[PDB]
Design an enzyme around this catalytic site. Sequence first.
Site, PDB file in Angstrom:
ATOM      1  N   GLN C  11       6.851   9.014  13.014  1.00 15.60           N
ATOM      2  CA  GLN C  11       5.924   8.737  13.912  1.00 15.60           C
ATOM      3  C   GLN C  11       4.513   8.813  12.663  1.00 15.60           C
ATOM      4  OE1 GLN C  11       5.596  12.710  16.917  1.00 15.60           O
ATOM      5  NE2 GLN C  11       3.317  12.852  15.451  1.00 15.60           N
ATOM      6  N   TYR C 224      -4.946  14.126  14.210  1.00 16.32           N
ATOM      7  CA  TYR C 224      -4.059  13.531  13.257  1.00 16.32           C
ATOM      8  C   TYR C 224      -4.735  11.541  13.567  1.00 16.32           C
ATOM      9  CZ  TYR C 224       0.461  15.607  13.328  1.00 16.32           C
ATOM     10  OH  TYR C 224       1.544  16.562  12.409  1.00 16.32           O
ATOM     11  N   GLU C 254      -1.691  -4.769 -12.304  1.00 21.95           N
ATOM     12  CA  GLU C 254      -2.065  -4.477 -13.190  1.00 21.95           C
ATOM     13  C   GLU C 254      -2.964  -3.219 -13.513  1.00 21.95           C
ATOM     14  OE1 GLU C 254      -4.854  -8.091 -14.926  1.00 21.95           O
ATOM     15  OE2 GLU C 254      -6.009  -6.405 -15.560  1.00 21.95           O
TER      16      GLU C 254
END
Lengths: 57, 421, 440
Positions: C11, C224, C254
């Site tokens: 989820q 959320y 890098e």
Amino acid sequence: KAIEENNNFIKMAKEKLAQKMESNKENREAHLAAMLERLQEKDKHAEEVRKNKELKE
Amino acid sequence: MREIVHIQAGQCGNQIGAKFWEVISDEHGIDPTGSYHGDSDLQLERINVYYNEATGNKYVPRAILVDLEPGTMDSVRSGPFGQIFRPDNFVFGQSGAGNNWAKGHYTEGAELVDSVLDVVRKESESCDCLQGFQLTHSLGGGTGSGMGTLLISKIREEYPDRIMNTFSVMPSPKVSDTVVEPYNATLSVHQLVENTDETYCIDNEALYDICFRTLKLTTPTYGDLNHLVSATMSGVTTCLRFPGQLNADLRKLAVNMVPFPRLHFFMPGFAPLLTVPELTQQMFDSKNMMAACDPRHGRYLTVAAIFRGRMSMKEVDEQMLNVQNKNSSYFVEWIPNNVKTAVCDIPPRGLKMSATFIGNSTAIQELFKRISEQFTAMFRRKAFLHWYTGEGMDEMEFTEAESNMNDLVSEYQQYQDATAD
Amino acid sequence: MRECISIHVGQAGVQIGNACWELYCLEHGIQPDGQMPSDKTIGGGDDSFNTFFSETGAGKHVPRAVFVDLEPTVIDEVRTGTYRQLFHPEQLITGKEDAANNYARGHYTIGKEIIDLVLDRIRKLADQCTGLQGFLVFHSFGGGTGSGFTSLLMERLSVDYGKKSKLEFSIYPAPQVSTAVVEPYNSILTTHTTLEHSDCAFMVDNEAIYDICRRNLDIERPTYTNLNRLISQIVSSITASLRFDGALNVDLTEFQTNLVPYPRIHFPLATYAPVISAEKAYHEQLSVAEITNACFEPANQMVKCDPRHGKYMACCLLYRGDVVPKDVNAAIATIKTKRSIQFVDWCPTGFKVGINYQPPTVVPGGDLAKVQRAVCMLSNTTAIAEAWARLDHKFDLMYAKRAFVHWYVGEGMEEGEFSEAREDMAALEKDYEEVGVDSV
Ligand SMILES: Nc1nc2c(ncn2[C@@H]2O[C@H](COP(=O)(O)OP(=O)(O)OP(=O)(O)O)[C@@H](O)[C@H]2O)c(=O)[nH]1
Ligand SMILES: Nc1nc2c(ncn2[C@@H]2O[C@H](COP(=O)(O)OP(=O)(O)OP(=O)(O)O)[C@@H](O)[C@H]2O)c(=O)[nH]1
Ligand SMILES: CC(C)(C)c1[nH]cnc1/C=c1\[nH]c(=O)/c(=C/c2ccccc2)[nH]c1=O
Ligand SMILES: [Ca+2]
Ligand SMILES: [Mg+2]
Ligand SMILES: [Mg+2]
């Protein structure tokens, strides 16, 4: 040496994984095998109870 | 995991089942024939958990109505939502049980059990993804007590990886004065400890005390007690029957609630029997517990709280923190963050705001000790054993049931005495 | 080439994928249907955005991504949502029955039934690539799938793709937004079994993101949706080096050279700025110096810990927008004298910089203010072990009483796996201690 060690890591990851997935399937089956065997032991007890009613009449 | 298969067994089980189905059919906008008449899409989003979709957009309960006594078939069929049930799902016996456990479990109920299992298998096979089973029953009767526990053990054999849940009604001398009820309950508890994933202890002593002292009724009928049980059962099934962002099924919730396999006996609670701080103080109070035990005489292993209605979630978060801070000693320190909360927009019919409480407290031993005391009062003088030993049972099995329930109480005590350091 | 395949598990992974992919689409001018009018080469290309997007002959720009979950309801909302046309149906893979907040079900019981299918679908994306760089795995620590299936997947990806790089975006649990009491177990288990198979892992503490949404964005009770939008901004800052063309743009690999001094020490602390509301942003331009200074304020971190009471092994600054080297250097010189930045004796103290000129974007109807410039600091500090410590303590309290252990054992796991995992974490904590100690 760079190939050897990259192969070693692929090798041992593959073997570690197969050993765990097999060990788990043994465990989960032995867990469910015990659970059903306790439930089948009740069916055998319920057959003695139903016999001890008829063998007391 | 979506479809749950309901089973109602005995008089108690069928009547609380009937009420359960009346309330949730009303909440989901289902009328007695079984047609959708509501407005919100949230009513249909997880309708499949409790209902099958028949032809002509007909929603039909996934219920299996079971009894050894006929007559209970008539009362359910004559009742407000009697038409909505599936006719073939009625599986009713002949001569009844007469408040005898060995009749329900070993002999007369064992003959009816395979015809019930046919209806279970037919309902379960049609489920896209069956999650588990809920059984409404009493533990003081004969059928629901004994045949209900045989169904549990038989359903376990064919569905070992499905969840098995029970709304088990605990017997009390204040509501029913039948003398052998302590024998029935203790034999059922010996089954429930082994074969169920979680059991709601809906206690008739607590329901009497609530009805008497809070609701003001001088002598309550079974109709009064069931108003509370149908409110509870609606509350504790809200997390499965509506979404929103919560993604929970019988197993997820059993995983978060049951830290040890044997200790799966919960203390329900409802509120009101209003502001958010009042709700939160009310649901944690011993007066609102549907089991007759005091939280403050033990410790919470886990808690689930479920609020319903339009309310500030910030305020609910503050209030649930508030009571955990203020009552810190009554929650085991060795399971962090063990009190969880969900909020549902849709309130129940009548109330604008309600809260429902599910608690795995070690204080539940107060319920098992009370039954154990009533049990050992009769058993130590071998009273009324001819009812049970006549049907085929042995005294050994009576001793085992007592010892298992005394171990259950010993273990609840062990974890209550446990400390982190 | 240099393609990057994202894998979104559970989820939290799936829903963070939506935030990320909606955000990349807006950044690259890709429409919901998948078309990109500014892209003149139809059917393919060697452009920077092609590292995350393959192209069809019909002009559709398709995410190089797989969404896996063991139940349908979260992935169903992508299948029927705004960006339904963006993904091929085979990229969206669902089971029927979830892992139930249990690592065992995600790794063994339910997870083994879908794992071969998942790898087959990852293989079709890998065969689209002319020079595959690696994988980005989005998942929660706490979920049963997030923890268990991810671990299984990572194990298998090491077999099928060797030492090809594997990055994680791991969601670290917080009680405010979680509903699972067994997350401490799932976390320690997945962290243990994945450790050998991940090359770099960016942890995101839900509490850290929760507090940021409350404090900086004035959201009373963050959902959320609120957290994921912020998370996607941080994820976009970290992947922007791969997705964009630039003269002063330093590649993520890098930075990784600087960030990972030993294989197990691969957990950079992320810190982002500015997170500011539209109201507060109005008539309030935040300079390079102000957002750079905000990176060393620990309220802005993705993981709750204190770098000031720990030691630095690397400091990288990923700027995006209206930023030139002159300003960055001035801002760094000011921070050096004024703040608690102590390095270990075996590392060099210089800050490493990257700049992307494409400015940051916001999702329409969001909470974040659109700003001209933004920065994400990736540091390797011993302080991040505090997150391990808090989580390892929660594990110990429960495991001492074997609370909930029967659920894991019932699905096939041994107690050996629990203690083995905890001992690895004990060693991990000890390793972060050791790297901070001065030389002799
Ligand atoms: N709360 C509540 N308790 C009930 C109800 N009906 C019966 N009981 C209780 O259930 C216990 C007796 O069990 P029953 O369910 O009547 O018996 P049974 O299981 O149908 O068994 P038989 O009567 O032998 O068929 C007593 O303690 C009753 O007080 C009800 O509608 N609500
Ligand atoms: N940041 C963020 N965290 C989330 C989201 N959804 C769930 N979580 C967190 O993830 C953890 C729970 O794991 P999930 O990802 O929901 O579970 P899952 O991986 O789907 O596994 P199962 O559902 O158990 O099969 C908790 O800590 C949640 O708070 C999200 O959209 N964003
Ligand atoms: C987060 C929240 C509140 C959803 C939660 N967390 C753990 N438990 C619950 C709630 C429940 N947990 C249960 O186990 C539960 C049992 C149930 C549901 C339907 C039918 C029978 C039992 N009902 C619940 O509401
Ligand atoms: Ca192109
Ligand atoms: Mg009856
Ligand atoms: Mg899930």
